[PDB]
Amino acid sequence: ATNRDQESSGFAWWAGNARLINLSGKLLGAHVAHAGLIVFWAGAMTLFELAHFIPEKPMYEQGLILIPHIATLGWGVGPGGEVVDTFPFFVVGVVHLISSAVLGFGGVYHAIRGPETLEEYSSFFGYDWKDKNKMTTILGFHLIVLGIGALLLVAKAMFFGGLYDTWAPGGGDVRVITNPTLDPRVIFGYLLKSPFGGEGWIVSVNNLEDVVGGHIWIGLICIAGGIWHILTTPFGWARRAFIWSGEAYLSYSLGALSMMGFIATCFVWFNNTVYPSEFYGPTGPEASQAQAMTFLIRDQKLGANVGSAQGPTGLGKYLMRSPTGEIIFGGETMRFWDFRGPWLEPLRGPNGLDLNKIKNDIQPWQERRAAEYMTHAPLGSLNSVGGVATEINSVNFVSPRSWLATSHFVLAFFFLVGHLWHAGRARAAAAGFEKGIDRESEPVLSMPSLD
Amino acid sequence: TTGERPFSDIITSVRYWVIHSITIPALFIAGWLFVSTGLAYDVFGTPRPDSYYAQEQRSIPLVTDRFEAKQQVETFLEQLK
Amino acid sequence: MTILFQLALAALVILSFVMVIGVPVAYASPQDWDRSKQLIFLGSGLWIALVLVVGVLNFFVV
Amino acid sequence: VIAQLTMIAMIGIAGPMIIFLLAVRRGNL
Amino acid sequence: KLPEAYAIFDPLVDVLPVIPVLFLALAFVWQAAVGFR
Amino acid sequence: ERGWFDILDDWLKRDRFVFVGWSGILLFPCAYLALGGWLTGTTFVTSWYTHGLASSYLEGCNFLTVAVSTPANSMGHSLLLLWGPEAQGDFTRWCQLGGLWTFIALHGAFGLIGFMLRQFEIARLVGVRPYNAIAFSAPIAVFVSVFLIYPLGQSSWFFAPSFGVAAIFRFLLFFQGFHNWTLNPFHMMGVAGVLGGALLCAIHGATVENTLFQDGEGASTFRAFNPTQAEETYSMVTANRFWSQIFGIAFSNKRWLHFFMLFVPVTGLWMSAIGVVGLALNLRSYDFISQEIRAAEDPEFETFYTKNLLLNEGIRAWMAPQDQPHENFVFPEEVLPRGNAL
Amino acid sequence: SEGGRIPLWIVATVAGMGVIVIVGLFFYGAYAGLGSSL
Amino acid sequence: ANLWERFCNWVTSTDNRLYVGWFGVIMIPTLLAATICFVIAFIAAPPVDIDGIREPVSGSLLYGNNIITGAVVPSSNAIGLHFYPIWEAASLDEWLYNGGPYQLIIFHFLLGASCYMGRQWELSYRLGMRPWICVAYSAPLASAFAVFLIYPIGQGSFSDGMPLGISGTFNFMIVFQAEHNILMHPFHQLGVAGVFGGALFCAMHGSLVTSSLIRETTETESANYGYKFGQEEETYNIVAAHGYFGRLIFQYASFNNSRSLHFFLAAWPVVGVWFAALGISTMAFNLNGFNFNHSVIDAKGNVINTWADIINRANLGMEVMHERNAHNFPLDLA
Amino acid sequence: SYPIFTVRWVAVHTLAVPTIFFLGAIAAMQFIQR
Ligand code: CLA
Ligand code: CLA
Ligand code: CLA
Ligand code: CLA
Ligand code: CLA
Numbered sequence A: 001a002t003n004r005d006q007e008s009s010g011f012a013w014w015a016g017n018a019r020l021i022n023l024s025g026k027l028l029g030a031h032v033a034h035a036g037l038i039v040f041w042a043g044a045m046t047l048f049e050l051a052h053f054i055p056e057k058p059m060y061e062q063g064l065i066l067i068p069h070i071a072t073l074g075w076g077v078g079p080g081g082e083v084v085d086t087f088p089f090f091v092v093g094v095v096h097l098i099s100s101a102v103l104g105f106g107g108v109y110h111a112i113r114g115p116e117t118l119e120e121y122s123s124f125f126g127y128d129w130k131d132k133n134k135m136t137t138i139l140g141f142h143l144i145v146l147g148i149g150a151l152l153l154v155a156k157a158m159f160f161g162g163l164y165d166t167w168a169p170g171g172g173d174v175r176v177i178t179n180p181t182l183d184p185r186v187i188f189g190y191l192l193k194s195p196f197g198g199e200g201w202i203v204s205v206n207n208l209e210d211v212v213g214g215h216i217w218i219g220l221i222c223i224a225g226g227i228w229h230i231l232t233t234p235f236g237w238a239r240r241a242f243i244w245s246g247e248a249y250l251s252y253s254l255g256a257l258s259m260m261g262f263i264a265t266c267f268v269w270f271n272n273t274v275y276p277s278e279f280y281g282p283t284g285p286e287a288s289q290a291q292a293m294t295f296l297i298r299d300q301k302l303g304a305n306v307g308s309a310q311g312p313t314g315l316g317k318y319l320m321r322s323p324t325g326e327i328i329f330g331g332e333t334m335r336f337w338d339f340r341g342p343w344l345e346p347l348r349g350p351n352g353l354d355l356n357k358i359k360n361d362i363q364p365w366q367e368r369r370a371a372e373y374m375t376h377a378p379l380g381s382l383n384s385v386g387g388v389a390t391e392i393n394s395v396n397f398v399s400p401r402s403w404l405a406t407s408h409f410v411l412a413f414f415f416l417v418g419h420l421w422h423a424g425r426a427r428a429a430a431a432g433f434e435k436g437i438d439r440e441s442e443p444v445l446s447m448p449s450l451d
Numbered sequence B: 001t002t003g004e005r006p007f008s009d010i011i012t013s014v015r016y017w018v019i020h021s022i023t024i025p026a027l028f029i030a031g032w033l034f035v036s037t038g039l040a041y042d043v044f045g046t047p048r049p050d051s052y053y054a055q056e057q058r059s060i061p062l063v064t065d066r067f068e069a070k071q072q073v074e075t076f077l078e079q080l081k
Numbered sequence C: 001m002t003i004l005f006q007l008a009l010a011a012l013v014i015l016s017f018v019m020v021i022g023v024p025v026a027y028a029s030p031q032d033w034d035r036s037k038q039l040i041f042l043g044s045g046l047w048i049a050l051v052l053v054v055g056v057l058n059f060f061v062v
Numbered sequence D: 001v002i003a004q005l006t007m008i009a010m011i012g013i014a015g016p017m018i019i020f021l022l023a024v025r026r027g028n029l
Numbered sequence E: 001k002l003p004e005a006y007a008i009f010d011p012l013v014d015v016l017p018v019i020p021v022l023f024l025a026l027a028f029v030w031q032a033a034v035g036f037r
Numbered sequence F: 001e002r003g004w005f006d007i008l009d010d011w012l013k014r015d016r017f018v019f020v021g022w023s024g025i026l027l028f029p030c031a032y033l034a035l036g037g038w039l040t041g042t043t044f045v046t047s048w049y050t051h052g053l054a055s056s057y058l059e060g061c062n063f064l065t066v067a068v069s070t071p072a073n074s075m076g077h078s079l080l081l082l083w084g085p086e087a088q089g090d091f092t093r094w095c096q097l098g099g100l101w102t103f104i105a106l107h108g109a110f111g112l113i114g115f116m117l118r119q120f121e122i123a124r125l126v127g128v129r130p131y132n133a134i135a136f137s138a139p140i141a142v143f144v145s146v147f148l149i150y151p152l153g154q155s156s157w158f159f160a161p162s163f164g165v166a167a168i169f170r171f172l173l174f175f176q177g178f179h180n181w182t183l184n185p186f187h188m189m190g191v192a193g194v195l196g197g198a199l200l201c202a203i204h205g206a207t208v209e210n211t212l213f214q215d216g217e218g219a220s221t222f223r224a225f226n227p228t229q230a231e232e233t234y235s236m237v238t239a240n241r242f243w244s245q246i247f248g249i250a251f252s253n254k255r256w257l258h259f260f261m262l263f264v265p266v267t268g269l270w271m272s273a274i275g276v277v278g279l280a281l282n283l284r285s286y287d288f289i290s291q292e293i294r295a296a297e298d299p300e301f302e303t304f305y306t307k308n309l310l311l312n313e314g315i316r317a318w319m320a321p322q323d324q325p326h327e328n329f330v331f332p333e334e335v336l337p338r339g340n341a342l
Numbered sequence G: 001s002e003g004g005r006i007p008l009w010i011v012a013t014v015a016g017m018g019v020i021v022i023v024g025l026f027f028y029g030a031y032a033g034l035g036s037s038l
Numbered sequence H: 001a002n003l004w005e006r007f008c009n010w011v012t013s014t015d016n017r018l019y020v021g022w023f024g025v026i027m028i029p030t031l032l033a034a035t036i037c038f039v040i041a042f043i044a045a046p047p048v049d050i051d052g053i054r055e056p057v058s059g060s061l062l063y064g065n066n067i068i069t070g071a072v073v074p075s076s077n078a079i080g081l082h083f084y085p086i087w088e089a090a091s092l093d094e095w096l097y098n099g100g101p102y103q104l105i106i107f108h109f110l111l112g113a114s115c116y117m118g119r120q121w122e123l124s125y126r127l128g129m130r131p132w133i134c135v136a137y138s139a140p141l142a143s144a145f146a147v148f149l150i151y152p153i154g155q156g157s158f159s160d161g162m163p164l165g166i167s168g169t170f171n172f173m174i175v176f177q178a179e180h181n182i183l184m185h186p187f188h189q190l191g192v193a194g195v196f197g198g199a200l201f202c203a204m205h206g207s208l209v210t211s212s213l214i215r216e217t218t219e220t221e222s223a224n225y226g227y228k229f230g231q232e233e234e235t236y237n238i239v240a241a242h243g244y245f246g247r248l249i250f251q252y253a254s255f256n257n258s259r260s261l262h263f264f265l266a267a268w269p270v271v272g273v274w275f276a277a278l279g280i281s282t283m284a285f286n287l288n289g290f291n292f293n294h295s296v297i298d299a300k301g302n303v304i305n306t307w308a309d310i311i312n313r314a315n316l317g318m319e320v321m322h323e324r325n326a327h328n329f330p331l332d333l334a
Numbered sequence I: 001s002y003p004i005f006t007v008r009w010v011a012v013h014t015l016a017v018p019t020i021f022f023l024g025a026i027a028a029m030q031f032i033q034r
């Protein structure tokens, strides 16, 4: 046993994995075994979801998060997002589950049987954290891998059946993407959009042409960047800016994953394109707008003139103006006027919600959809009692959007903490004071008094 | 240390487990039966699911008199037929 | 083909269980590593075969 | 219900069994 | 539901997703066996 | 002198796994019964006859919703002794009348006295100053003000807190709707002392852990300390410079620092207790009179203060009929305060 | 009688598994019978 | 040294009475702007249409508030999550009506307080300290983010951010209870354990260290003079402290290691408050407290109320009364 | 070598004995149907 107690390693059991920092073989095992765990869950969770799945209920009434991801890719679904074939879901689950055994095998082998360090075994697989060129090479390999991943999505969309398009003319459907957006003005334009209301940065992406085009760009950027990093070593200015150690690199990635976590939270909360409401349920903004739509329809059927109906405050009860004048739904949902959805858009004119369209053109499928979304708003208790906090037990419902937003906020937050923990530690360790202040060389004692 | 036998000694010994593989399950089962026989309801005076209300009653049997409170409860219990 | 399928899958499950306990114990056991390494090789090839068998027979039972 | 509790019993014991078998055999824990 | 041929494995499938959690718990059993050294 | 008293004193004060002491004679039975009574009630005992509530695991409640509930309002402030004129020795009837509530509250109170006596007794034997016992006066002031003085100023024990998670939450919301207790500067000082205490706990713990001297080679730094060591384990000088430069001020005196850590949460709790003594008498900080005079005359004048009173009025009207069943409240739909739509 | 016969890591693992089972049963009971809302 | 080199040396100087540093370069101007705007708004701002229903709420002292009722009022529901800087308004009068000061203040504050956290790492590095004081500060910081940014994001409006005022804070809490049943949420319960426990352990630690101070003074002087800033020897007897507390409870429930004890003191409140922050930040996406409304039912099907149902009645009162002119439709969906 | 019945022994059993009894009771309750 090498380095497997506190005396020899300097790390207590509860920091046990830090004993692995300079043992590239065992650390490869840890990583491969862990990748096994992720793949295991993906596979097993899918099979669990499928076994529990009732095809004629909406997915979002069934506590499903993985089947919705598969369906968005265009597998197993048809018009309106109806399930036409569960077999693609079965395949995804089984293939992940089988693959996890392989990863688990390699992980266990490297972790307990294989060479503890890889450097003496191989110059290609061995590494020194402080070897800047080797670090950028491995980074380069992984960037190429990621670029290929992004192009796999492009391949599915363009050449292997397409993607589920909630926006498809005549109703949501799986659609092949033949004209992906290549224009860098549009693609990178998203990146420079404000993250505030009515803009929403990248979260605002609202059509599959832009999504696919983005991944073409990202795929090429990642492959080009990967080649770049294999062929180069870090420049002088980068050398002087960073800490070059295993723990430092971990900290950079923790920071990055934290950022991505918060982005994913906002993506699933607001976006209804890559998170189709057919599969994930209505967004918070969507369901609130759907309520206003529902009662506008109801009261207009009863004879209300919804354009001229003045609410208790003086603002229109059903319809009012946004701060820039667009006609929008009234009541509290005034905040949600940036919402856009396939069931609502046919009522939209140049100036916002069109009163003549509202009076004459609302179709029964719009009433149904608005009623459905209003009554599946993403509100519910921790024990999955659907609805407002004062609602009685009856409906077993928490929106997948809530499950996915909350989990990813928690994860992103703790990852920011991990970033700070490890970035601060990497700095201190590099400078040589992570274990405490040298009693005979206490820096503050050589500094002038503040006063 | 204060003179008593270390806990880690005790709970890793065969004799402890010979004794306690009997006494622990015995207590657990006795607790179970305290409920499953219905004795718990009787000791504490807790309503069974069919004993909160008479068939047509929707009014709570609230105690409203301090010194005749015992009789009131007894009267409420009688009215469950 | 349902007889072939349903038992091939049971055999897949059973072997997986054996491997799940067996592989790490073998890897970390001091003696009998020679006998272990071949059994692990055998189990792995047989595990892979059974996956493919179940995979093929799936389409003659679904 | 009986079928589900039997599965998690075999699956549940697997981990502790690995450790136990290794501890008995003076394995590389 | 799973395809009918696999229905007998329903109870097994119900349990599988929780297995990753067992790996975390296993780390503790293992450490207890080596006295958290 | 070597009589039975001194021999008893000897045995009571033996150095054992669980110290006993003279204080133990009060503490152990009272604490055991308070805790046992709570577990017994939450497991098996109803609140049907006192509150019209289920409150035990037996009835289907969970850990959050179980409680030992207060007696019916009609009991007033009855001691509700098992052998008293209400239960008349009947254990079952005693449970149904809320006898376990006064049982837990009263053994709880004597148990807390025992615990504080224990703090004094041990401090005396070990030869330390009794600041731990002194600090414990804050928990006692809270327990006594909230569980005893408050209901004693009200109609009955019914309005004391019931011993339960959800029940205590109900008690918080009652105090908002009826007492506007958030508006009370004694509660506000309590909040500052609790949050200030939590702040001090976190910041001091973190400062010590981040100004540690390197006293070992290990990257895990806990082993590099010895209980009997003479030296400070962390640098006060470096800590002081850090906070002086970050925040503007810093502790420079460790004795002051640690006294302040006693002072802040202890003083906070004592302040909250004083406010609750006022609430026993409905002597609330409910209103700002100037605010009300203005708002009554001027229907365009609105503050967060006036908004919160509307919330309070909703709480009162919506919760009172079920929360105060002895009043037999019947509030027709048409009288219930509601805003538009909701 | 002799202290050490049954390893402490086994006692902890079994006791821990016992706690998980009982708590698990309590959670099952939240969805069935009394307190289930059904 | 050139000018840039000199400037860098001053910015990062360990000798400045207050540390500046690179985080401080952002922190100083942002915190000053937030502070100045807050002070002026709190004294002098006119009423603000918080709920976008042309019903302005007065927050400032000069417009009829005292310290307890006063606030800087959140921006208009008509704005929602739209960015409303001064230059987006047609005039200061419009900016004020719509609650522009709130956005200016909370955005500068959140930026500044994030830099305050970075600055704590930064100075610890310059002084050769361990780096994690900033991780403790991440707990209150995360909490501020929850109530000023994450909750507004989830609900779709900064009008639902916590007001900058004492009574406005209580308003936020009561409405939060109505809409999320926060009291019944385990993350808020962990938060309460965090702060009650933080206060308990604060008092405990204070009392135990104070109880075991080594006699260095006479009765006519403060015992505080018994400790001298920078002395090498510890000022209390930890062995006597542990001897006391270990007997109060039992030996093994007491810390004999000061590093372990102080770590516990850091960890308990920080972790609890992280859960508090995460409670708010996840109820922001309407995953709410436990709902046991009508959970207990008799043999016939009669509802048997529990304390959960009484909570529910209180919550209903809050719900039906809040923002009494803002709802036109039967469900409050954000 | 060691006593068995001590103050500690009593303290432990005043808690442990009812705890196991109560856990059995509460387990049984999970099977009660209205
Ligand atoms: C990819 C992400 C990642 C990686 C590879 C690491 C890796 C490492 N960390 Mg960092 N860390 C991370 C993210 C990560 N961490 C995050 C997100 C946080 C914020 C909490 C931290 C905070 C942190 C601290 C405070 C410390 C480390 C330390 C370490 C080292 C030892 C770890 C160890 O042995 O743990 C052993 C594992 C445990 C003791 C189990 C932890 C139990 C968790 C908290 C509960 C899990 C809850 C679960 C998800 C849900 C409930 C399930 C139920 C069954 C309980 C190692 C280099 C140590 C160090 O600094 O060494 C250099 C150290 O002191 N990490
Ligand atoms: C994702 C979770 C994870 C992973 C992948 C690892 C990985 C690793 N750890 Mg860490 N650790 C973890 C979590 C993890 N740890 C947690 C939560 C804690 C706190 C309890 C620790 C505390 C810790 C300490 C204190 C140490 C490690 C060490 C190690 C390494 C050597 C382990 C060893 O010597 O086994 C010996 C154990 C056995 C031989 C028993 C069997 C173990 C195998 C792997 C179980 C496999 C079971 C699986 C079901 C089999 C499937 C096979 C199938 C595919 C065919 C290994 C790379 C050690 C190290 O750093 O050495 C240099 C070390 O000292 N860990
Ligand atoms: C991204 C993570 C994620 C998300 C969003 C979901 C979402 C969902 N799951 Mg899935 N699942 C996950 C991971 C996730 N799961 C994992 C890791 C497992 C293995 C255990 C499972 C296995 C699983 C099963 C078997 C089932 C679900 C089900 C569900 C649904 C109901 C969930 C529920 O009732 O929660 C209840 C809430 C809790 C248990 C509380 C969790 C609180 C944790 C402990 C706090 C974590 C804090 C932090 C990470 C720890 C840090 C500590 C700090 C000190 C550092 C919901 C759609 C159910 C379903 O409907 O399927 C169709 C169902 O039956 N899941
Ligand atoms: C990140 C993953 C990873 C990495 C970097 C390594 C690296 C290494 N392995 Mg390990 N291993 C892994 C995972 C990994 N392994 C997995 C998943 C398994 C189970 C199948 C194993 C089981 C294993 C054993 C039994 C042995 C090694 C050995 C080795 C060493 C020599 C390998 C060699 O010569 O290949 C040269 C190249 C080839 C043989 C051709 C590779 C063909 C690949 C598979 C094509 C497909 C690539 C594709 C992009 C993968 C995508 C997967 C993705 C979906 C996850 C080297 C240190 C040896 C060792 O350490 O010696 C003592 C050794 O005996 N590995
Ligand atoms: C995982 C992804 C990854 C990682 C970890 C790295 C890591 C590294 N890169 Mg590589 N790179 C990548 C992918 C990656 N690269 C890809 C995909 C490409 C192709 C575009 C490149 C092309 C590339 C070049 C040309 C260079 C590097 C360089 C470097 C080094 C320093 C980078 C740095 O200072 O960043 C910090 C970033 C900056 C200093 C930029 C300015 C910072 C602004 C103010 C931040 C604004 C972002 C903000 C958070 C908001 C986001 C939205 C915004 C767009 C509006 C470092 C080894 C350098 C190197 O030394 O080459 C050998 C270098 O010259 N990379």
Ligand code: CLA
Pocket (backbone or CB within 6 Å): F025, F026, F029, F030, F033, F079, F080, F081, F082, F083, F099, F102, F103, F104, F106, F107, F110
């Ligand atoms: C030190 C431990 C202690 C303390 C301080 C208390 C205190 C209390 N108990 Mg608890 N109790 C204890 C231990 C304790 N108990 C134990 C070990 C048990 C298990 C048997 C109980 C079981 C118990 C029950 C079931 C009840 C109480 C109740 C009470 C309350 C009223 C008691 C009373 O009126 O006594 C009056 C008696 C005295 C104060 C003793 C006076 C002694 C004097 C000095 C001597 C004079 C007596 C003389 C010889 C008699 C001659 C009379 C002659 C003329 C006929 C009070 C809070 C009641 C309560 O909680 O109701 C809500 C109640 O119902 N206790």
Ligand SMILES: CC1=C(/C=C/C(C)=C/C=C/C(C)=C/C=C/C=C(C)/C=C/C=C(C)/C=C/C2=C(C)CCCC2(C)C)C(C)(C)CCC1
Pocket (backbone or CB within 6 Å): A029, A030, A033, A034, A036, A037, A040, A094, A097, A098, A100, A101, A103, A104, A105, A107, A108, A111, C012, C013, C016, C020, C054, E006, E009, E012, E013, E023, E024, E026, E027, E030
């Ligand atoms: C290193 C380490 C660790 C870890 C480990 C790991 C992480 C692992 C893994 C692993 C893994 C990750 C594994 C695995 C696996 C798997 C498997 C074994 C599988 C399988 C499968 C199957 C058998 C299938 C089947 C089926 C089908 C085909 C169809 C339908 C149905 C069913 C389901 C029946 C720990 C912490 C302990 C610590 C020490 C060290």
Ligand SMILES: CC1=C(/C=C/C(C)=C/C=C/C(C)=C/C=C/C=C(C)/C=C/C=C(C)/C=C/C2=C(C)CCCC2(C)C)C(C)(C)CCC1
Pocket (backbone or CB within 6 Å): A186, A187, A188, A190, A191, A202, A205, A210, A211, A212, A213, A214, A215, A217, A218, A241, A242
């Ligand atoms: C797919 C997709 C897309 C696209 C995308 C893209 C195109 C992108 C990108 C991206 C990017 C392009 C990014 C980025 C970035 C960056 C970053 C994140 C950064 C950073 C940084 C840092 C961290 C730094 C640092 C520092 C400083 C500041 C100072 C000095 C020191 C240091 C160095 C430390 C779209 C939307 C269309 C749509 C959908 C899908």
Ligand SMILES: CC1=C(/C=C/C(C)=C/C=C/C(C)=C/C=C/C=C(C)/C=C/C=C(C)/C=C/C2=C(C)CCCC2(C)C)C(C)(C)CCC1
Pocket (backbone or CB within 6 Å): A097, C013, C016, C017, C020, D011, D012, D013, D014, D015, D016, E016, E019, E022, E023, E025, E026, E028, E029, E030, E032, G009, G012, G013, G014, G015, G016, G017
């Ligand atoms: C896919 C699949 C599979 C798989 C499997 C596996 C992968 C498994 C595993 C497993 C495992 C992985 C397990 C485990 C475990 C464990 C455990 C059961 C644990 C525990 C624990 C505890 C209870 C703890 C405790 C403690 C200690 C030790 C110390 C300190 C304290 C405490 C108390 C915390 C099979 C073959 C079925 C076949 C079909 C399919």
Ligand SMILES: CC1=C(/C=C/C(C)=C/C=C/C(C)=C/C=C/C=C(C)/C=C/C=C(C)/C=C/C2=C(C)CCCC2(C)C)C(C)(C)CCC1
Pocket (backbone or CB within 6 Å): F032, F033, F035, F036, F037, F038, F039, F040, F103, G019, G023, I014, I015, I018, I019, I020, I022, I023
């Ligand atoms: C009242 C009374 C009395 C008494 C009694 C008693 C003293 C009792 C007791 C009792 C008891 C003494 C009981 C118990 C118990 C218990 C239990 C029922 C438990 C439990 C538990 C649990 C369930 C746990 C869990 C948990 C926790 C908390 C922590 C962490 C994790 C877990 C989740 C594991 C007398 C006769 C004088 C008289 C008259 C009245």
Ligand code: OEX
Pocket (backbone or CB within 6 Å): A332, H051, H077, H155, H159, H160, H175, H179, H322, H323, H326, H332, H333, H334
């Ligand atoms: O704004 Mn402030 O509080 Ca949130 O829920 Mn809807 O919006 Mn209004 O009602 Mn309820």
Ligand SMILES: [Ca+2]
Pocket (backbone or CB within 6 Å): H299, I033, I034
């Ligand atoms: Ca029945």
Ligand SMILES: [Cl-]
Pocket (backbone or CB within 6 Å): A330, A331, A332, A333, H326, H327, H328, H329
């Ligand atoms: Cl509305």
Ligand SMILES: [Cl-]
Pocket (backbone or CB within 6 Å): F307, F308, F311, H171, H175, H321, H322, H323, H324
């Ligand atoms: Cl309000």
Ligand SMILES: [Fe+2]
Pocket (backbone or CB within 6 Å): F204, F208, H205, H209, H262
């Ligand atoms: Fe201290």
